Amino acid sequence: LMVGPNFRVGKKIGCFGELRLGKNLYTNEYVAIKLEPMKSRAPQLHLEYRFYKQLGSGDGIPQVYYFGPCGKYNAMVLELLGPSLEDLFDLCDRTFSLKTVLMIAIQLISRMEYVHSKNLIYRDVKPENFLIGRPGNKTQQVIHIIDFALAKEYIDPETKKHIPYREHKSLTGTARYMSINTHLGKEQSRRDDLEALGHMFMYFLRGSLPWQGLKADTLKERYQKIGDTKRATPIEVLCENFPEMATYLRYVRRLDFFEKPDYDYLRKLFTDLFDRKGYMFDYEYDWIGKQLPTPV
Ligand SMILES: [Cl-]
Ligand SMILES: [Cl-]
């Protein structure tokens, strides 16, 4: 029924546990309640909360309100957001205008810059993890990054050194947007968040990516096929008609493991495009004036 003093648990609104609609009874505000069975054999909720705390208050970071026990679950109470870019992607007939994608990209490079500024790498880029604010809120226009369960501190706290390079890192997440180097079992760094973004920007522009249908008998082999197709798809072909996207992807693909990405350059690739195309950054995304779903 209740999370901590004041948060009432509500209906299931999503599915390592479930997401519930919650209400702060003390403020009359709806909230998100991410639950996780206490009997989880591989818990992620507490480490995710810890990453959220580490992120603090950022533009497009979901506020977090409570982490505590909830019957036979552990609960994390955070800010209730709207649809994901994937949900929105579907409402927009699985393509987005260049303006939508550019407004998304400009934002999410800054979102990613911020995450990286807090000594974290994200490692779970995917449209489903980028949520607009709520249908009426001051933040419906803002694309928020969620789900920090797969994040990593890429700067070691004691030494203040970048994490060392390594390989034979096993593959587990979403294969569709992951960097080529993630496919090669390399330790992910800041570059890989940014490349995965580029893949997703291309997914949005094209409607699909050319490795998105690939199936294999094991998942290891499927990652391999997808990775092979990524390597075998020239950026110039993947990004035909989108020159700055190819420029973005080459840049991020060529980043050294340790290299701090030049976020300003990448953002300017896109803001110059945006300007040149005659676009106005007015948050008038493709899905504006559509019937968007609600959590509540
Ligand atoms: Cl009430
Ligand atoms: Cl996939």
Curated annotation (Swiss-Prot):
GO biological process: endocytosis; positive regulation of canonical Wnt signaling pathway; protein modification process; signal transduction; Wnt signaling pathway
Glycoprotein listed as a keyword: no
UniProt domain Protein kinase: residue ranges: 7-275
Binding site residues for ATP: I13, G14, C15, F16, G17, E18, L19, K34
Broad class of the protein's primary localization: cytoplasm
The entry's keywords: Acetylation, ATP-binding, Cytoplasm, Kinase, Nucleotide-binding, Phosphoprotein, Serine/threonine-protein kinase, Transferase, Wnt signaling pathway
PTM field: Autophosphorylated.
One Gene Ontology cellular component annotation held by this UniProt entry: cytoplasm
One example GO MF annotation: protein serine kinase activity
Location(s) in or outside the cell: Cytoplasm
Quaternary state and interactors: Monomer.
Job of this protein: Serine/threonine-protein kinase. Casein kinases are operationally defined by their preferential utilization of acidic proteins such as caseins as substrates. It can phosphorylate a large number of proteins. Participates in Wnt signaling. Regulates fast synaptic transmission mediated by glutamate.
Similarity remark: Belongs to the protein kinase superfamily. CK1 Ser/Thr protein kinase family. Casein kinase I subfamily.
UniProt name for this protein: Casein kinase I isoform gamma-3
Species annotation: Homo sapiens (Human)
Upper taxonomic lineage: Eukaryota, Metazoa, Chordata, Craniata, Vertebrata
